[PDB]
Structures are given as structure tokens and as C-alpha cells.
Amino acid sequence: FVEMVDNLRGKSGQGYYVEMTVGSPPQTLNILVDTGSSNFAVGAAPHPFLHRYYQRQLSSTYRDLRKGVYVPYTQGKWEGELGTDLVSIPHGPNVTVRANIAAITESDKFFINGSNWEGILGLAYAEIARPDDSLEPFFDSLVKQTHVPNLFSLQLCGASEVLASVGGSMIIGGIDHSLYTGSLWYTPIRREWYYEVIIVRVEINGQDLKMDCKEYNYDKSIVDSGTTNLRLPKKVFEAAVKSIKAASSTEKFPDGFWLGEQLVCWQAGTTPWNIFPVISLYLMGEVTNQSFRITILPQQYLRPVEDVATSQDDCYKFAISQSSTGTVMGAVIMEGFYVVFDRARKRIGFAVSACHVHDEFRTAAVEGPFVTLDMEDCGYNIPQTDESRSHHHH
Ligand SMILES: O=C(O[C@H]1CCS(=O)(=O)c2ccc(Br)cc21)[C@H]1C[C@]2(CN1)C(=O)Nc1ccccc12
């Protein structure tokens, strides 16, 4: 798995991308690794934020599916013509694959200036692929076409005129034991659509938020690599901030900081991480009654930003934000750990990363088991609308 080690690059808060080549002869692109979508979509026309793009015309292997695709997220929209081509991950498994490609012809607030990515690699399930579940996702194609085991793991690692460079690893087909320390704990994938988990309990410096666990998973809890922040639902974010503020009461920060719209600065290397609390998310274990906690350090939820003016100071952005689409375990969470997407066994494993950011007093931890007798169902049931009820799947 060494050839796959350090295969992810990127800028802080703009995403982790993997180099892929599309077509015959292979056109090389930088593709955003995203676990909260199921589409393999690439820039196929000029755009001001696009250095290069996919040119179908120059591929002997390109096939037009004579069908269009339109994908609007809550933050971003893209659209294009669907087809298939030969896809390969240079610094991934030594395999070439015939995959569905969505050639992005028009987009809106999707591509990021200087992010260095020309497309998206939707690693989630068919159940969320567009225009429907019959459009086979890349990973699904990779497994059906090769002998590649139905699993992948991500090791996302953190970090003055440009943003700070990020590194990381995408291991397709297995687990790399040198990427983690300690035990690898698993949480069931609730449903195969998004990589859905169930958070059963939350604690800020040991102090339980004391909320009804369904609120932690309202309306869903997902693991998304294409999200920078730990996005929580309105009620949970409110409780979390009230608590974080309480532990960091010695120093008073502006309101714009908690809304993640402003930095806070301390003289180089004088940052008081000690005054900041740990967030422990308790995830539902493989055994019913059982759970394990993933502990996150202020070094994860406080993203550093080196401002051109305040270059002599260490400035940070509060990387916990509000969400209406549920809890999102983005890069903030992921950076501390080695995350295993064990699709084969319908589960997600976490272990302490061999690359995470920490201080001499505290360390990001994966600990368990924690038993809870007569524990309620923490998962939420999304009201079934007439649009979702109308659908047919054979
Ligand atoms: O979670 C995700 O997508 C979800 C978001 C909630 S949603 O409900 O807007 C939605 C809808 C359909 C699909 Br497929 C995925 C998603 C994906 C898409 C995501 C982040 N990760 C994004 O939201 N903007 C953006 C912009 C550039 C690159 C990636 C993204």
C-alpha cells in the first residue's frame, strides 16, 4: 500500500484531491475526494477557476451516453453531459476502469479559486447518485471490473501569501497498519446512501451535553471528506458553543469567531490550547448497548490561518458550524484519525492517525467500549415525502 501513501494534496479548507487520468490517451486531472456524493464529475469546459479541464474530443475511448446531469448542493451547483471513459488512479491500484463520467459544462459556486482540483470523486452509494441510482458510481465500477476488495480508507493530515498545504492518503482495497496506532473501532453504516453513522452521546470536557441522542442525528449524521468543518444541527451547535465558551471563559472572543466569520490571534507559539475543551463523539458500536468515543482536540476544531498582515501571530478559525442537513463529520474530525470505509462489511472504522496534530498534554483518542443499558434508538426517520414515495427500484 506504500504507492498509495501520500497520494492526497490540497490547500487548508479547500479539500483533499487525488490525481486521476481520464481517457485514451490519459488526460491528467486533480480530483476532490468526496464521501458525501456518488458522482464522478469533471470540468469539461472553460471556467475562470479551472487551470485545465477534460476534453472528450481527444479520447479514442470516450462514449457519449446522450443524457444530461444537474447536481445542486446546498453550497454549489454543477451540470453536464454524461458518458463513460477509461479512468485510472496513477498513485492508486494498478488498474484501468471503464467508468461513468459527468462532463461539467456549466457550474455555480462549485470550483474553488486555487483549490487545485478540476473534479469530484463521489465515493458514497448509488442511492444518492444523479440523475438516479442506476448510474453506477466509480467505486462500484472499480470493484465490479477488478479484484479490488470492497473497502477504502482515508488518512487526512492537517498542516503566508497562499493557504497552507495539506497531505494525506487514500488507500483503495485495504487497511495500512502503519497509518494508525491503537485499536480500530467500528460503527455500523446505518443505511447505504451517504456514509451514515449514529452518534449516541456528545461531551465537552467530560460534560455530557445531556440532549436526546436523536438530536445528534437530526436529520442525519454523515462522514464527509469534502466538508472542512464539523457541522452540527442548530440545537446541538448552540449547546456545543454554550459549553466551549464556558470552558474558554478566561479569554473573551467576538461573536464573529463562533460564527466562523473571524480569526483570533496569539503571539507565535503562545496559543493556550489548554483553555480549550475536547469534544468526544460517542458512536454506536458494532454490538448493541456498546459504543466508542472519538475524541477531538482544539488543534482540530480551530483551523490555523496565517494572515499576510498578522504574520507574527498564530491566527485561528473556529471550524465547528451550523447545519440544516444534519451532523457532518468533515476534515476537522477526520484529520485526527484513520477512517476505514468497510463497504464489504457495511461499517466505518476509526483509529488514531499516525499523522494527527497534538500537544504534550492531550491526544486525539479512539476509546471503547462504553455500555448503556436500555438505550433508545438515536437514529432519526426522515419524513417520507410524496416525491420519495413515488420512486421505483427493480
Ligand atoms: O456532502 C456533500 O453533498 C451533500 C450536501 C448536502 S445536500 O443535501 O445539498 C446534497 C445533495 C445531493 C448530494 Br449527491 C450530496 C449532497 C458533498 C458535496 C459538497 C460537500 N460534500 C457540498 O455540499 N458542496 C460542495 C462543493 C464542492 C465540492 C464538494 C461539495
Coordinates of C-alpha atoms and ligand atoms in Angstrom, one line a residue:
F1 CA 0.0 0.0 0.0
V2 CA 3.1 2.3 0.0
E3 CA 2.5 3.5 -3.6
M4 CA -0.9 4.9 -2.3
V5 CA 0.8 6.6 0.7
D6 CA 0.8 10.5 0.5
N7 CA -1.4 10.4 -2.7
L8 CA -3.6 13.3 -1.5
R9 CA -2.6 17.0 -1.7
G10 CA -4.6 20.2 -1.3
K11 CA -4.9 23.6 0.5
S12 CA -6.4 24.0 4.0
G13 CA -10.2 24.2 3.8
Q14 CA -10.4 23.7 0.0
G15 CA -10.3 19.9 0.1
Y16 CA -8.1 16.8 -0.4
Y17 CA -7.7 15.8 -4.1
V18 CA -6.3 12.7 -5.8
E19 CA -4.6 12.6 -9.2
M20 CA -6.6 10.6 -11.7
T21 CA -6.2 10.3 -15.5
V22 CA -9.3 10.1 -17.8
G23 CA -9.4 8.8 -21.4
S24 CA -7.2 7.4 -24.2
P25 CA -4.6 8.9 -24.3
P26 CA -4.9 9.7 -20.5
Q27 CA -5.7 13.4 -19.7
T28 CA -4.5 14.1 -16.1
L29 CA -6.8 15.8 -13.5
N30 CA -6.8 16.6 -9.8
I31 CA -10.0 15.2 -8.3
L32 CA -11.5 16.1 -5.0
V33 CA -12.0 13.0 -2.8
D34 CA -15.6 13.3 -1.6
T35 CA -17.6 10.8 0.6
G36 CA -20.8 12.9 0.7
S37 CA -21.7 12.3 -3.1
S38 CA -21.8 9.4 -5.5
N39 CA -20.8 11.1 -8.8
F40 CA -17.6 11.1 -10.8
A41 CA -17.9 14.6 -12.4
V42 CA -15.0 16.5 -14.0
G43 CA -14.7 20.1 -15.5
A44 CA -15.3 19.7 -19.3
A45 CA -15.4 23.3 -20.4
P46 CA -13.5 26.6 -19.5
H47 CA -14.2 28.2 -16.2
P48 CA -12.2 31.1 -14.5
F49 CA -11.2 28.8 -11.5
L50 CA -10.2 26.0 -13.8
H51 CA -6.5 25.6 -14.8
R52 CA -7.1 22.6 -17.1
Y53 CA -10.3 20.5 -18.0
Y54 CA -11.5 17.2 -19.5
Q55 CA -11.6 17.3 -23.3
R56 CA -13.7 14.4 -24.6
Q57 CA -12.8 15.1 -28.2
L58 CA -9.2 13.9 -27.7
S59 CA -10.2 10.5 -26.3
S60 CA -10.5 7.3 -28.5
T61 CA -12.2 5.6 -25.6
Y62 CA -14.9 8.3 -24.8
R63 CA -18.5 7.2 -25.2
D64 CA -21.5 9.7 -25.1
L65 CA -24.5 8.4 -23.0
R66 CA -26.8 11.1 -24.7
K67 CA -28.1 12.1 -21.3
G68 CA -27.6 15.3 -19.2
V69 CA -27.0 15.6 -15.4
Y70 CA -27.8 18.5 -13.0
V71 CA -26.4 18.4 -9.4
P72 CA -27.3 21.3 -6.9
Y73 CA -25.8 21.1 -3.4
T74 CA -26.8 23.5 -0.6
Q75 CA -23.3 25.2 -1.3
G76 CA -22.6 24.6 -5.0
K77 CA -24.2 23.5 -8.3
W78 CA -22.8 21.7 -11.4
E79 CA -24.3 20.3 -14.6
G80 CA -23.1 18.4 -17.6
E81 CA -23.3 15.7 -20.3
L82 CA -23.0 12.0 -19.1
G83 CA -20.7 9.5 -20.7
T84 CA -18.1 6.8 -20.0
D85 CA -14.3 6.7 -20.3
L86 CA -11.2 4.9 -19.1
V87 CA -10.3 6.0 -15.6
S88 CA -7.1 5.3 -13.6
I89 CA -5.6 6.5 -10.3
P90 CA -1.8 6.8 -11.1
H91 CA -0.8 6.6 -7.4
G92 CA -3.7 4.1 -6.6
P93 CA -4.3 0.5 -7.7
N94 CA -2.5 -0.5 -11.0
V95 CA -5.9 -0.9 -12.8
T96 CA -7.7 0.9 -15.6
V97 CA -11.5 1.1 -15.3
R98 CA -14.5 1.9 -17.6
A99 CA -16.4 4.4 -15.5
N100 CA -19.3 6.9 -15.8
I101 CA -18.1 10.5 -16.1
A102 CA -20.2 13.6 -15.8
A103 CA -18.5 16.2 -18.0
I104 CA -19.3 19.6 -16.2
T105 CA -20.2 22.1 -19.0
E106 CA -21.8 24.7 -16.6
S107 CA -21.2 25.2 -12.8
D108 CA -22.1 27.7 -10.0
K109 CA -20.0 28.3 -6.8
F110 CA -18.6 24.8 -7.1
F111 CA -15.0 25.1 -8.2
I112 CA -12.7 26.9 -5.6
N113 CA -10.0 29.5 -6.6
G114 CA -6.6 28.0 -6.0
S115 CA -8.0 24.7 -4.6
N116 CA -6.1 22.9 -7.5
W117 CA -9.0 20.4 -8.3
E118 CA -10.8 20.0 -11.6
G119 CA -13.4 17.5 -10.5
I120 CA -15.1 15.4 -7.7
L121 CA -14.8 11.7 -6.8
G122 CA -18.1 10.8 -5.2
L123 CA -17.2 7.8 -3.1
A124 CA -20.7 7.2 -1.5
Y125 CA -23.5 4.9 -2.7
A126 CA -25.7 4.7 -5.8
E127 CA -28.8 5.6 -3.6
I128 CA -27.5 9.3 -3.9
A129 CA -26.0 9.3 -7.5
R130 CA -27.7 11.6 -10.0
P131 CA -29.9 11.6 -12.1
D132 CA -30.7 8.3 -10.3
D133 CA -29.3 5.1 -8.6
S134 CA -28.9 3.3 -12.0
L135 CA -25.9 5.5 -12.8
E136 CA -23.1 3.3 -11.3
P137 CA -20.6 5.2 -9.1
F138 CA -16.8 4.9 -9.7
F139 CA -16.0 2.7 -6.6
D140 CA -18.9 0.3 -7.7
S141 CA -17.4 0.1 -11.1
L142 CA -13.8 -0.3 -9.7
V143 CA -15.0 -3.3 -7.6
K144 CA -17.2 -5.0 -10.4
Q145 CA -14.4 -4.6 -13.0
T146 CA -11.3 -5.7 -10.9
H147 CA -10.4 -7.9 -8.0
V148 CA -10.1 -4.8 -5.7
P149 CA -11.6 -5.6 -2.3
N150 CA -14.8 -3.5 -1.4
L151 CA -13.1 -1.2 1.0
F152 CA -11.0 2.1 1.2
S153 CA -9.5 4.1 4.0
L154 CA -8.6 7.7 4.3
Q155 CA -5.7 9.3 6.4
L156 CA -6.3 13.1 6.2
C157 CA -3.4 15.1 7.7
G158 CA -3.6 18.8 8.7
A159 CA -0.6 21.2 8.3
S160 CA 1.8 33.2 4.2
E161 CA 0.9 34.5 0.7
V162 CA -1.1 31.3 -0.2
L163 CA -3.1 28.9 2.0
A164 CA -1.2 26.0 3.9
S165 CA -0.6 22.8 2.0
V166 CA -2.4 19.6 3.3
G167 CA -1.3 16.0 2.8
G168 CA -3.0 12.6 3.2
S169 CA -3.6 9.1 1.9
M170 CA -6.3 7.3 0.1
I171 CA -5.8 3.5 0.4
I172 CA -8.1 1.7 -2.2
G173 CA -8.7 -2.0 -1.4
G174 CA -7.4 -2.3 2.2
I175 CA -6.1 -1.0 5.5
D176 CA -2.5 0.2 6.0
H177 CA -1.4 -0.6 9.6
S178 CA 1.4 2.0 9.6
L179 CA -1.2 4.8 9.2
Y180 CA -2.7 4.2 12.6
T181 CA -1.8 3.4 16.3
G182 CA -4.1 1.5 18.7
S183 CA -7.3 -0.2 18.1
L184 CA -9.5 0.2 15.0
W185 CA -13.1 0.6 16.4
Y186 CA -16.2 0.2 14.1
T187 CA -19.6 1.9 13.8
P188 CA -22.3 0.4 11.6
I189 CA -23.2 2.3 8.3
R190 CA -26.9 2.9 9.2
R191 CA -28.1 3.0 5.5
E192 CA -26.0 2.7 2.3
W193 CA -26.7 6.1 0.7
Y194 CA -24.4 8.5 2.5
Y195 CA -21.8 7.1 4.9
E196 CA -24.4 7.4 7.7
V197 CA -23.5 6.8 11.3
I198 CA -25.3 7.2 14.6
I199 CA -23.8 9.4 17.3
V200 CA -25.2 8.2 20.7
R201 CA -23.6 10.8 23.1
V202 CA -21.5 14.1 23.0
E203 CA -19.3 15.5 25.7
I204 CA -17.4 18.8 26.1
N205 CA -14.5 18.2 28.6
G206 CA -16.3 15.2 30.1
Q207 CA -19.5 17.2 30.5
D208 CA -22.3 15.4 28.6
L209 CA -24.4 17.8 26.5
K210 CA -27.4 15.9 28.1
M211 CA -29.5 16.1 24.9
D212 CA -31.8 13.5 23.4
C213 CA -29.5 11.5 21.2
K214 CA -31.8 11.8 18.2
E215 CA -30.9 15.5 18.0
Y216 CA -27.3 14.4 17.4
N217 CA -28.5 12.6 14.3
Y218 CA -31.2 15.1 13.2
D219 CA -31.9 14.7 10.4
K220 CA -28.8 12.5 9.6
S221 CA -25.2 12.1 10.7
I222 CA -22.7 11.6 7.9
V223 CA -18.9 11.1 7.3
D224 CA -17.9 13.6 4.5
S225 CA -14.4 14.3 3.4
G226 CA -15.5 17.1 1.0
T227 CA -16.5 19.1 4.1
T228 CA -13.9 21.1 6.1
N229 CA -16.0 21.6 9.3
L230 CA -17.7 19.6 12.0
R231 CA -21.2 20.7 11.1
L232 CA -23.8 20.1 13.8
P233 CA -27.7 20.6 13.8
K234 CA -28.9 24.1 15.1
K235 CA -29.8 22.8 18.7
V236 CA -26.5 20.8 19.0
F237 CA -24.2 23.6 17.6
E238 CA -26.0 26.0 20.2
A239 CA -25.3 23.6 23.1
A240 CA -21.7 22.9 21.9
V241 CA -20.9 26.7 21.6
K242 CA -22.5 27.5 25.1
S243 CA -20.2 24.7 26.5
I244 CA -17.0 25.6 24.6
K245 CA -17.4 29.4 25.6
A246 CA -17.9 28.2 29.3
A247 CA -14.5 26.3 29.3
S248 CA -12.7 29.1 27.4
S249 CA -14.3 31.8 29.8
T250 CA -10.8 33.3 30.8
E251 CA -10.4 34.9 27.3
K252 CA -13.4 36.6 25.7
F253 CA -13.7 36.1 21.9
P254 CA -16.0 38.1 19.5
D255 CA -19.3 36.7 18.2
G256 CA -18.0 36.7 14.7
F257 CA -15.4 34.0 15.7
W258 CA -18.1 31.4 16.8
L259 CA -20.0 32.1 13.5
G260 CA -16.6 31.2 11.9
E261 CA -16.6 34.6 10.1
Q262 CA -13.5 35.9 12.1
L263 CA -10.0 34.7 13.3
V264 CA -8.5 35.0 16.9
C265 CA -4.7 35.6 17.3
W266 CA -2.0 34.8 19.8
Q267 CA 1.8 35.6 19.5
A268 CA 3.6 32.8 17.6
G269 CA 3.8 29.7 19.8
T270 CA 1.9 31.2 22.8
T271 CA -1.6 29.7 21.9
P272 CA -3.3 28.5 25.1
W273 CA -4.8 25.1 23.8
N274 CA -5.2 24.1 27.5
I275 CA -8.1 26.7 27.9
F276 CA -10.0 24.9 25.1
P277 CA -12.0 21.7 25.7
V278 CA -12.0 18.3 24.0
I279 CA -15.1 17.1 22.0
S280 CA -15.9 13.4 22.4
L281 CA -18.4 12.0 19.9
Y282 CA -19.7 8.6 21.1
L283 CA -20.6 6.4 18.1
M284 CA -22.9 3.4 18.2
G285 CA -20.7 0.3 18.4
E286 CA -21.0 -3.0 16.4
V287 CA -22.5 -4.6 19.5
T288 CA -25.9 -3.3 20.6
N289 CA -25.6 -1.5 24.0
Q290 CA -21.9 -0.7 23.1
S291 CA -20.3 2.5 21.8
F292 CA -16.8 4.0 21.5
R293 CA -15.7 7.6 21.5
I294 CA -13.7 9.6 19.0
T295 CA -12.1 12.5 21.0
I296 CA -11.2 15.7 19.1
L297 CA -8.6 18.3 20.2
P298 CA -8.7 22.1 19.8
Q299 CA -5.9 21.7 17.2
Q300 CA -8.7 20.1 15.0
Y301 CA -11.7 22.4 15.6
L302 CA -9.5 25.6 15.5
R303 CA -8.1 25.8 11.9
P304 CA -4.9 27.9 11.7
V305 CA -4.9 30.8 9.1
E306 CA -1.6 32.8 8.6
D307 CA -2.8 36.3 7.7
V308 CA -0.4 38.3 5.5
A309 CA -0.8 41.4 7.9
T310 CA -0.7 39.4 11.3
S311 CA 2.3 37.2 10.1
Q312 CA 3.9 37.5 13.6
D313 CA 0.7 36.0 15.2
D314 CA -0.9 32.5 15.1
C315 CA -4.5 33.1 13.9
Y316 CA -7.3 30.5 14.1
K317 CA -10.7 30.0 12.6
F318 CA -13.4 28.1 14.7
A319 CA -14.1 25.2 12.4
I320 CA -17.4 24.0 14.0
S321 CA -20.5 25.3 12.1
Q322 CA -24.4 25.0 11.9
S323 CA -26.2 22.7 9.5
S324 CA -29.8 22.0 8.4
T325 CA -28.8 18.7 6.6
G326 CA -27.7 17.1 10.0
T327 CA -24.3 16.4 11.7
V328 CA -21.4 16.3 9.2
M329 CA -18.0 14.7 10.3
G330 CA -15.8 16.7 7.9
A331 CA -12.0 17.1 7.7
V332 CA -11.9 18.6 11.2
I333 CA -13.0 15.2 12.6
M334 CA -11.2 13.1 10.0
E335 CA -7.7 14.8 10.4
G336 CA -7.3 13.2 13.9
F337 CA -8.0 9.7 12.7
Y338 CA -7.5 6.9 10.1
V339 CA -11.1 6.4 8.8
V340 CA -12.0 3.0 7.2
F341 CA -14.9 2.7 4.8
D342 CA -15.6 -1.0 5.1
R343 CA -18.3 -1.2 2.5
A344 CA -17.9 -5.0 2.3
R345 CA -18.9 -5.3 6.0
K346 CA -21.3 -2.2 5.9
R347 CA -19.3 -0.3 8.6
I348 CA -16.9 2.6 9.4
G349 CA -13.7 2.1 11.4
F350 CA -11.7 4.9 13.3
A351 CA -8.3 4.6 14.8
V352 CA -5.8 7.2 16.0
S353 CA -3.9 8.6 12.9
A354 CA -0.1 8.3 12.7
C355 CA -0.1 11.9 11.4
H356 CA -2.5 14.0 13.6
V357 CA -1.8 17.4 15.3
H358 CA -1.4 17.3 19.1
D359 CA 0.2 18.9 22.3
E360 CA 2.3 17.3 25.1
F361 CA -0.8 17.0 27.5
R362 CA -3.7 15.6 25.3
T363 CA -4.0 13.3 22.2
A364 CA -6.9 12.5 19.8
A365 CA -8.3 9.2 21.1
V366 CA -10.4 6.3 19.8
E367 CA -11.6 4.5 23.1
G368 CA -14.2 1.9 23.9
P369 CA -16.4 0.1 24.8
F370 CA -18.9 2.2 26.7
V371 CA -22.1 0.4 27.7
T372 CA -25.6 2.0 28.0
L373 CA -28.5 -0.2 29.3
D374 CA -32.0 0.2 27.8
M375 CA -30.6 2.8 25.3
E376 CA -33.2 4.4 22.9
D377 CA -32.8 4.4 19.1
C378 CA -30.7 7.5 18.3
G379 CA -31.3 7.5 14.6
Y380 CA -33.9 9.8 13.1
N381 CA -36.5 8.8 10.5
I382 CA -36.6 11.4 7.6
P383 CA -40.3 12.2 6.9
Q384 CA -41.2 10.3 3.7
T385 CA -42.4 12.9 1.2
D386 CA -44.6 12.1 -1.9
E387 CA -41.5 12.6 -4.2
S388 CA -39.5 9.8 -2.3
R389 CA -42.7 7.6 -2.1
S390 CA -43.3 7.8 -5.9
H391 CA -39.9 6.2 -6.9
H392 CA -39.5 2.7 -8.3
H393 CA -36.3 0.5 -7.9
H394 CA -36.2 -3.0 -9.5
Ligands
LIG1 O1 -22.0 16.5 1.3 C1 -21.9 16.7 0.1 O2 -23.1 16.9 -0.6 C2 -24.3 16.8 0.1 C3 -24.5 18.2 0.7 C4 -26.0 18.2 1.3 S1 -27.1 18.3 0.0 O3 -28.3 17.9 0.6 O4 -27.0 19.6 -0.5 C5 -26.6 17.2 -1.1 C6 -27.5 16.8 -2.1 C7 -27.2 15.8 -3.1 C8 -25.9 15.1 -3.0 BR1 -25.4 13.8 -4.2 C9 -25.0 15.5 -2.0 C10 -25.3 16.5 -1.0 C11 -20.7 16.8 -0.8 C12 -20.8 17.9 -1.8 C13 -20.1 19.1 -1.2 C14 -19.5 18.7 0.1 N1 -19.5 17.2 0.1 C15 -21.1 20.3 -1.0 O5 -22.1 20.3 -0.3 N2 -20.7 21.4 -1.7 C16 -19.5 21.1 -2.4 C17 -18.8 22.0 -3.3 C18 -17.6 21.4 -3.8 C19 -17.2 20.1 -3.6 C20 -18.0 19.2 -2.8 C21 -19.1 19.8 -2.2

